[PDB]
Design a protein around this ligand. Structure first.
Ligand SMILES: [Zn+2]
Ligand SMILES: [Zn+2]
Ligand SMILES: [Zn+2]
Ligand SMILES: [Zn+2]
Ligand SMILES: [Zn+2]
Ligand SMILES: [Zn+2]
Ligand SMILES: [Zn+2]
Ligand SMILES: [Zn+2]
Lengths: 339, 339, 339, 339
């Protein structure tokens, strides 16, 4: 009846580790026992409450929780006790709005979000909607699979909406937490991959993961270089959306090409409409994804095509993890290990 | 031997009506006797030398010339003497680059542009490439059809790239020279049309042409109203591309929707990345169109679905017309009448 | 506690109008009072039990029932008492299989079918799944809207999967119970309609409904004719699926075109793989549609774009209705009027 | 002045290896010195004149000729002397019909076909239209690349039109001359490949080339097995269209899936309309492809993803070759070597 969990009580404050009541599932709900729980920058923004729509205090963060179905409410048929599931950002949606009926539930105006508008996975247990959980692959461990619920589906869907075709070129801009996962999806999707970053080790990693071309933006203008070397990319996935990354993306793409934006930066970005219109460039926003996107993302992991860089930490130490993220001292993804 | 033509001999200077030699079709070329010749803002930009890539001086403007094939060079099979044809913006393209092979010849780096890089239809005769001329509908007059070569194909392709389909909502932003034509194409394409402008008469016109709803942005916030009334529009066609229209388009579009920018504004626009990403919005530019787009655009006119607002002027009075366009005192489209 | 209902108790046997218990909604279910109930050939097949997968006896047919929500079980948020709803062929689907997740719930292997695998609309009351009912437009009467639940969505979805665009040609093959509805959707979707049939009166009905071209296959080869007169059709909707209509569709469609089969005939059809391959033709089947398809199809009715030719009858005369259908003596659609 | 060439002079007869005049390029044409020349079953059908539209006698067959541009006609700009090119099935097209304008020149009704309606590559030299030749990759030898002009583009385009996405399952039906190349393209396109045939040596070749699953059609039932093993294939590419292969494809395909037919068999094939409609299956014909398809297909060979199994033979032995083909006793692809 009691469990440990990291709670946000004041925006900007450190999280407190508490013993709170174990959530019980009602009709059409399930309870999940958390075995691992991914951490990412979205959790920082949730804890700082610096986005337009804020979480309601207090709340348990975490939209990358994975574990076992430990209890089942009435009317549940998709999963059963013992099943390995994840509880992603899309906690639930209404299921009958236009978006939901067309398989774009990720756009549902009535959606709830895990570890944001409802309690998430920074706890030993969590109550989820079984219609929206991710069904985890048998072959992949909890720690390794957790980031796929977030980083994985985000970059996979992002790549899909670049509208690129096997054999065509895609630039992965930024080979960090998201980017290094993106390279692997891109290669698995038959794309020729160009990696762009400012860190030579990250570029090497990209090459190892499948990138045929890699350019260090500190040593050379990536736009001019790529235009010359590959004739511009058919697609660009921008995983870290800084003003510079945005501008460079526009310069790197070939005529008729598409730029997909994964990040959520603040402010207005300078956009060369003249060039975009003239060059017939498309700019498209894409974050997370639908249930089908998620299952597809998980399958690539199961098949051995994608493996996130993961490092573990304990629930108790979640505040140290946050600190490391804030300072940009994390390489890969960090995952809380509950076992 | 000789013919009258309006000629640009210096950028920014008034045009002069000169007697010049009648152009002669060589092999693979045809000669066209101009019966009418549309005028639009692009001609100003051409005559002003406003754009980064300029016409060579001196030149005869006019990318909206229509008339009869008057002479046929050797090796021509597509048209014959007497055929009614138009010589649109796309004078020619290479035909074998990646873009040309994919049916996107509008992106051809090697393209020539009528009344810009080569002489156009502000003259009694013009030489054209028969592989790129528009084949005009039997049933529509020269004056009436001229603007379809430019305004028509521009808004039609624009609507196509909003990726909408019958029954869905599209906003036509701006019911002016392009906008009044766009409303008609949109309705013929089975779209529900919401018109937005600041002029009562233009909004009335929009409704007359098939718009289901009309919002006057002077009196009501069209973003707020449309979000509340129709849940936002699946597509937005921005026909007057200003910073304000851009920002309002983002407000009017529903999640997952597409904004098409139908013009070449100067200077960067501020793009709120956060909203674009969260809402999963697509932004793209669309100006003119391919030969396929052009033929399709003309067929809609032939079928009676689209009729541009047109008033005539004489070649001799071209500078007055330029003046009126510059002042923004033109309602509809102006077409030079050579009859 | 009781109600009238037409019940099938023996396959092939005349239906019996019986007094049966009024069905009560459990958790997540709703009850609908039927005001009108469309009849079609699918009901004959249900009653005859001649399809591979058969209904369980005894059962109440009817998948075109429309009426008011008369009661609501617990955990129901989509509808409430008084709401006008329809209970279409797709009674329920699992909601989480590959097909359901992608908004293709019509392919769900676990689907239930109204008036086939569960009791349907040939009764005064029926219990339905609120997540799958059709939400009816306020401005259309129960009798007029009923056939939209079946004929409407069927031909609308069929038209969608012909992959045709506004301005393109579509052949409506057979201008009968389905076809006369199809001509109307097609025109509302911006398609040029060519009607093909062997009944002059049916062909003239097509023209009245917006067909531009009409060919009697009895005296003229529609394939040869259309290939000459319009260049072949971009799409063909076959609403009366016979081997001849099928073979002719293959001749009528232009290269790269698409044939949609809108029916469930018995037996294998001879298909000239040679012509299909050489002509790059696409062939696919389509019946009824998804919840999204249904709501979209109802919208066209709400806007006055589509009206089915409807005649009414009494529940007690259902066997007579069946009789007329079996003989082919039905013009338009027949709807049981529960008033 | 003169050259060796294999000529068809009578339908069904042995080819005569003669000395004939060397074709000379006129305006807009180029001359190609053949270095290698693929042979395939289409060549047999050309020589036997058993297709509805027949070649005109006499003629030199061969639509898989590759070599060097040996001479250039007037006004040619796409290629130059020395360039390595191939002369595929699509010799030329309108350039301006609806199909050509939309980048589907493969469907042009006015197309010429290499080694069928015009002289082909079974000779030391050939004249071709530079606008339609394949531009060969630098690092691939003539013998190796030749079959890509026919087998390669055919299966690549076929795979594209199965509408399958990376991570999805495709069955390659028949691992023969076409099939063994198809397995390689499919793998490069991120598809998971199930190879199906009746020859265990072929299936081992498949696995060798990346097939993840292989099932012998004479051993077990492929439909039942794949439905169990994989849940059915999202796509099926039928490279050898035998009545049993066609029937088995309809059984192997997943609900909502697509079957692409690459073959040109004689006669009608039985198609279960009932199942096709109910399972929402798409049947699509596809052979060869556009210039864009061809260049993409060559790019995969350049990138190292695709290599045809090739064996050489001398021009003077072409009759022996045909003999080997007819007896279904040819492994991989035979290429005539003019070195
Ligand atoms: Zn995350
Ligand atoms: Zn929703
Ligand atoms: Zn213009
Ligand atoms: Zn080009
Ligand atoms: Zn029905
Ligand atoms: Zn399902
Ligand atoms: Zn061949
Ligand atoms: Zn053509």
């Amino acid at each position: 009846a009691m469990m440990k969990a990291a709670v946000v009580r004041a925006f900007g404050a450190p999280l407190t580790i508490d013993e709170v009541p174990v959530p019980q599932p009602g009709p059409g709900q399930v309870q999940v026992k958390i075995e691992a729980s991914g951490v990412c920058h979205t959790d920082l923004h949730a804890a700082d409450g610096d986005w337009p729509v804020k979480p309601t205090l207090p709340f348990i963060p975490g939209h990358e929780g994975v574990g076992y179905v430990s209890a089942v409410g009435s009317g549940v048929s998709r999963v059963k006790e013992g099943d390995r599931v994840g509880v992603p950002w899309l906690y639930s949606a209404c299921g009958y709005c236009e978006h939901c009926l067309q398989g774009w539930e990720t756009l549902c105006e009535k959606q709830q979000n895990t570890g944001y508008s409802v309690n998430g996975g920074y706890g030993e247990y969590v109550v989820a909607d079984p219609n929206y959980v991710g069904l985890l692959p048998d072959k992949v461990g909890f720690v390794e699979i957790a980031p796929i619920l977030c980083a994985g589906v985000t970059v996979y869907k992002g790549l899909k909406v670049t509208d690129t075709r096997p054999g065509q070129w895609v630039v992965i801009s930024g080979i960090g937490g998201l980017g290094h996962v993106a390279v692997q999806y891109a290669r698995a999707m038959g794309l020729r991959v160009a990696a762009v970053d400012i860190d030579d080790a990250k570029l090497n990693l990209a090459r190892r993961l499948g990138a045929e071309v890699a350019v260090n933006a500190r040593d050379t203008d990536p736009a001019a270089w790529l235009q010359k070397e590959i004739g511009g990319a058919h697609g660009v996935l921008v995983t870290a959306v800084s003003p510079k990354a945005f501008s460079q993306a526009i310069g790197m793409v070939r005529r008729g090409g598409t730029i997909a934006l994964n990040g959520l930066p603040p402010g207005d970005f300078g956009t060369p409409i003249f060039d975009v219109v003239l060059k017939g460039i498309t700019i498209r926003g894409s974050i997370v994804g639908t249930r089908s996107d998620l299952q597809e993302s998980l399958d690539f992991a199961a098949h051995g095509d994608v493996k996130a860089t993961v490092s573990t930490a304990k629930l108790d130490d979640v505040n140290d993890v946050f600190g490391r993220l804030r300072e940009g001292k994390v390489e890969g993804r960090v995952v809380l290990d509950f076992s």
